[PDB]
Amino acid sequence: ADDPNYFIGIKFRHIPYEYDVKIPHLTFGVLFISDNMIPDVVEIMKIMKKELFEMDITTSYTYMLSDGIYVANVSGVLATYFKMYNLFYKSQITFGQSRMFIPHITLSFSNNKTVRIESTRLKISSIYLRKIKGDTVFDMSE
Numbered sequence: 001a002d003d004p005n006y007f008i009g010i011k012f013r014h015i016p017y018e019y020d021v022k023i024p025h026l027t028f029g030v031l032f033i034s035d036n037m038i039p040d041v042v043e044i045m046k047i048m049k050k051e052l053f054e055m056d057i058t059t060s061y062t063y064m065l066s067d068g069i070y071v072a073n074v075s076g077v078l079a080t081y082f083k084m085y086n087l088f089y090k091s092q093i094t095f096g097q098s099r100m101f102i103p104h105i106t107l108s109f110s111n112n113k114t115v116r117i118e119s120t121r122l123k124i125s126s127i128y129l130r131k132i133k134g135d136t137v138f139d140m141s142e
């Protein structure tokens with residue numbers, strides 16, 4: 001569906017930028033799932049963990065994703081994204097949207113223009129599964 005109720009998200013110890021947003025995270029997939037499907041989604045989340053923490057994430061610049069969306073790019077994440085995409089799909093879990101996935105960290109919800117830095121590596125602090133406009137049901141730390 002394109003009305004997801006849950007999403008997987010990633011949180012980093014520090015951001016090499018400045019942000020208005022109350023919570024800085026990397027969205028890593030959105031889901032349309034029923035609570036009786038919470039365990040299965042957790043297992044895959046458990047299964048992907050090693051690669052998720054062996055992932056080399058980096059930022060080089062910031063940009064406007066869309067009108068009034070100011071974000072920072074992230075790279076090194078797409079392969080493990082599609083790997084997990086396959087795992088969800090094969091368990092018949094609705095994961096994905098019609099629109100293509102772009103990995104980003106939302107920095108602000110206002111119009112600002114690009115900043116740059118040397119390639120810098122993001123260190124994951126947490127990976128979680130959370131309901132949309134809702135509580136976090138599951139958390140994983142390294």
Ligand SMILES: Nc1ncnc2c1ncn2[C@@H]1O[C@H](COP(=O)(O)O)[C@@H](O)[C@H]1OP(=O)(O)O
Pocket residue numbers: 027065066069099100101102104105106
């Ligand atoms: N590929 C994309 N292209 C344009 N906008 C996107 C894209 N992916 C996400 N967004 C929008 O940027 C916002 C960043 O939110 P997040 O904290 O989850 O990263 C999303 O709410 C989304 O707003 P929208 O769904 O209205 O298009």
